[PDB]
Design a binder for this molecule. Sequence first.
Ligand SMILES: CC(C)(COP(=O)([O-])OP(=O)([O-])OC[C@H]1O[C@@H](n2cnc3c(N)ncnc32)[C@H](O)[C@@H]1OP(=O)([O-])[O-])[C@@H](O)C(=O)NCCC(=O)NCCSC(=O)C[C@@](C)(O)CC(=O)[O-]
Ligand SMILES: CC(C)(COP(=O)([O-])OP(=O)([O-])OC[C@H]1O[C@@H](n2cnc3c(N)ncnc32)[C@H](O)[C@@H]1OP(=O)([O-])[O-])[C@@H](O)C(=O)NCCC(=O)NCCSC(=O)C[C@@](C)(O)CC(=O)[O-]
Lengths: 422, 381
Amino acid sequence: ISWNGFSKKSYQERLELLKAQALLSPERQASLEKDEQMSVTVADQLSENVVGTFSLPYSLVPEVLVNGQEYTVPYVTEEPSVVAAASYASKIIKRAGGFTAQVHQRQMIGQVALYQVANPKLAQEKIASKKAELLELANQAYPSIVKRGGGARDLHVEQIKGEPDFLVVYIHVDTQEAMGANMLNTMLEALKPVLEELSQGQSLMGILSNYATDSLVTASCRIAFRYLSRQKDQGREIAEKIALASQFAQADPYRAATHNKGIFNGIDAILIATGNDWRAIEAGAHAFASRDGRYQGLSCWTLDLEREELVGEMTLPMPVATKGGSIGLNPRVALSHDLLGNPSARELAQIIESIGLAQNFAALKALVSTGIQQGHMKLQAKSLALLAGASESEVAPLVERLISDKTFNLETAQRYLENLRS
Amino acid sequence: GHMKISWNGFSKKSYQERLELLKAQALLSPERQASLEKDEQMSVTVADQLSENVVGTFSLPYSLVPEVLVNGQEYTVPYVTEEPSVVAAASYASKIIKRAGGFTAQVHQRQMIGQVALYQVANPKLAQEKIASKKAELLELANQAYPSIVKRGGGARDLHVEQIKGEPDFLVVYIHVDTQEAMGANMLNTMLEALKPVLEELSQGQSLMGILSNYATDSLVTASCRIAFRYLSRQKDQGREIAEKIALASQFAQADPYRAATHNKGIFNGIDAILIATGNDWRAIEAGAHAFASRDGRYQGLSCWTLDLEREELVGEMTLPMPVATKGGSIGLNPRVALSHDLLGNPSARELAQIIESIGLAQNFAALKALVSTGIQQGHM
Ligand SMILES: CC(C)(COP(=O)([O-])OP(=O)([O-])OC[C@H]1O[C@@H](n2cnc3c(N)ncnc32)[C@H](O)[C@@H]1OP(=O)([O-])[O-])[C@@H](O)C(=O)NCCC(=O)NCCSC(=O)C[C@@](C)(O)CC(=O)[O-]
Ligand SMILES: CC(C)(COP(=O)([O-])OP(=O)([O-])OC[C@H]1O[C@@H](n2cnc3c(N)ncnc32)[C@H](O)[C@@H]1OP(=O)([O-])[O-])[C@@H](O)C(=O)NCCC(=O)NCCSC(=O)C[C@@](C)(O)CC(=O)[O-]
C-alpha cells in the first residue's frame, strides 16, 4: 500500500492507512487510536512540581528512505507546514534514491577542569605519561563486558589559555545504547582525586560535554535535476539557486541562523517523538556550526553539473539514544521507536540526520522558487477545503479558487465547493 | 512579607496538594483553574489545525517554578520539561535569588530583522548607493503590504545594504521591523517578498530569497542578579568559595567550547521549558542564541558570573536574543498555552522576554552551584 493521497486524508483515514501498512503491533495501534497519553502519575516521576500535562500534535512523515531502508517518521511539532515540508522533501528524495548516511564515531566526551596548578606543563606530561594507568583505572569495573572496544578508550590533557589558565583532562567513553552517564560519572569520580594529586591542583568540575564531536553523523542525498522541477531545464536553475542558498548561509550568519533553524524544526520534532534531549543536540550542533571561526550553515548543497545532480550533505553531533529517560515511561515515545522498527541508536541517528537534511531541502527549494509565503497559504486553503467536505479529486480546484482570493474562511470554501458541485 | 500564603515545602507536596496551594494563591480564574484540574489538553481537532498528517497528540509534563522575582514583580513560571531535576533546580535557584533581591532585566530593542539576498549585480557599489538612498520609499513600500501592523504602532523602521564578499558576491538588504506582540514571521516575509521585485530593479541583479532572520540582534535582552555571599551557603562563611568557584566555572565556559556547549545547554533546559509552556518557538531562540555565543569569533558561554569582592557579592548576567511573542501561533489554540500566559499575569512580549531571560540565568546558576559543590552524579529523587 502506498502513501499516495495521504495529504488529503482525514484523521480517521490516516489511522486506517497506518493500520494498513502494518507497522504497529495490535497493542500500539490501539494505544494510538485511543490517543493514549503519558499519565499525570508518570509525568510526576519525570519532572518536579508537576500540576498537569502539556500536549502537542503528533504526526507522521512517510517514505523516509535511509540506506535503502524506508521508514515512517514520527513528528511532534506545533508549527504549520513543517510536517508537510518534510513529507514533500522525503518523497522527492526517495525518488532520487533516498539518503545515504553513516555514523563516524559514537563516543561521549567527559572533562575535568583543574585550576591552581603550579606547573601545568609538568602536570600535563605527568598525567599524560600515566594515561595507561588512568584509563586502566577507569576500566577496572568493566573488564570484558565493556572492554570489547568500549569503555574509556582515550584520554589526554590540554592547556587551555585564558583568565585564568585551566588544565583540562578529556576522557572518551563508548556510549552504548542507553542515555546513562552512570558509566561516565563512575570514571570521572575516581579520576578527579588522582588528577588532583598528579597535577597538584584543584578540581573545578567533572562533567559530560554536549559538544559531542566523538558522535558525528553524516547524511547525504543526490537528486537529479529532472526531479527538482516539472518544467523543462528549470530543475537545473532551481538546483543552482539551492546551491547559492547554501553558500549564502556560509557567508552571512544572519542567514546561517535561519538556515540551521529550519533544520531543527524537523530534528527536534523527531527527537521529541523518540524521547531524546533536543537541548543537547541543539547545543552541540550549533556549536559545531562555528567550528571554523564563524557561525555558518550546518549543511552543504553543491552542483554535480556533469551528472546533472544536486548534492546535499550535513554532518552533526548526534549522540541520540534508544533506552532510558522518558522512552520507557512515555507510551507515545515507545510507540515512536516501534513505528521506526526499533532501530539501533546508530540507525536512529542516521534517520534523524536524514530528516534534518530533508527538512533543509524543502525550505531552500521554497525560498528560491515560489517563496515561503505561497506555500503557507496553500496548506490553509487545503485544510479548509477538507473541512468543507471536498473529495480528493476536488481539493486542488478548490485550493486554486481559495488561494485566488485574498482572505478565505471555512464559509468561503463551503460556498465555492457548492459551486464546484453545481 | 507574610499575610500571603507561602511556597515553603512546595517540593514536598503531592500532586493534588500542589493544585490546592496554587488555588490558594488565586493566580488563575475559575475557568483556568478548573481547566488545569481537569488537565484539559489540546484536542486532536485543534492539533489538526497546527500540523499536518496528525494522527494523535503527544504529552509532556507541566510544572510550576515559583517565586521568580523579576524587577520587583514576582511570578509563578510554567515549565514543560521531560528531564528530572530541571524544575527542582530552577525553583531552588529562584528562591535563593529572590532572597538576594531577585532579577533586574531590560529589553534593549524589540525589532525583527528580515533580509533579501541579491546576486549577479553588475555594480554592487552603485547598487548599494541606489538602494540606500531610497530607504524612505522602500520602507514605506514594506509597510504598505502589511498595513495592520502600522495601525498598531509597528512596522518597518530601518533599512541598510551590505556587500558580503565571497563566492559568489551577495548584496544583502536588511530591514528592521517593529512586530509588536507577535513574532512577525508572516509579517516580515510578506514585506520582503514585496521589496524583492523593486530591489531587483534598483540593483539590476537577481533576487535569491527574501526571508526572516533568526539572528535577532535587534531583540537583545539581558537579566542580572546580585547575590550576597551569605546566601550562597547555609554555613554563611563558605559562600565566598562557592562564589569564586562559580566564577571559575563561568570562565571555563568562556575558554573551552567543550564546556560552553554544556554550560549553554543547561541554560536552555529552562529557557525551552518556558518557551513551550508559553507556546513560543524554541528552535528560533536556540538558533539565534547559539549563534550569538560565537559573536566574538569563538563559541563561548552565554552568561557571565563575576565577583564583587568589595561588596562581597556574586554577579550574574546574560544577554540573549529573545524575540518572543504573546499573540499568534498556538497561543490561543493550545488551552494550556493560554493558561500559561494568564498564570504569568498576561505579561507583554517585552515583559515575557525578561522573565525568560531571568529564568535561564536562574537555571544556569543552579547547575553551576551543583557542579562546583556536590556535583551532578545522578540526583535521583
Ligand atoms: C508545504 C509545501 C509542501 C506545500 O506545497 P504544495 O504545492 O501544496 O504540495 P502538494 O499539496 O501539491 O503535494 C505535494 C506533496 O507534498 C506533501 N504534502 C503537501 N501538502 C501536504 C499536507 N497538507 N499535508 C501532508 N503532506 C503534504 C505531500 O507528500 C504531497 O504529496 P501527496 O500526499 O499529495 O501525494 C511546500 O510549499 C513547501 O515545501 N514549503 C516549505 C516549508 C518549510 O520548508 N518549512 C516549514 C517551516 S517555515 C521556516 O520558518 C523555516 C525556514 C523556511 O525559515 C528555514 C529557512 O529559512 O532556511
Ligand atoms: C536539585 C537540588 C535543588 C537538590 O538540592 P537540595 O538542597 O538537597 O534540595 P532541598 O530539598 O534541600 O531544597 C529545597 C528547595 O529546593 C527546590 N527543590 C529541591 N528539591 C526539589 C524537588 N524534588 N522538587 C521540587 N523542588 C525542589 C525547591 O525550591 C525547594 O524549595 P522548598 O519546597 O523546600 O520550599 C540541587 O541539588 C540542585 O539545584 N541541583 C542542580 C541540578 C540541575 O541543575 N539539573 C538540571 C538538569 S542537569 C543539566 O542541566 C546538565 C548540566 C548541569 O551539565 C548543564 C551545565 O553543565 O550547566
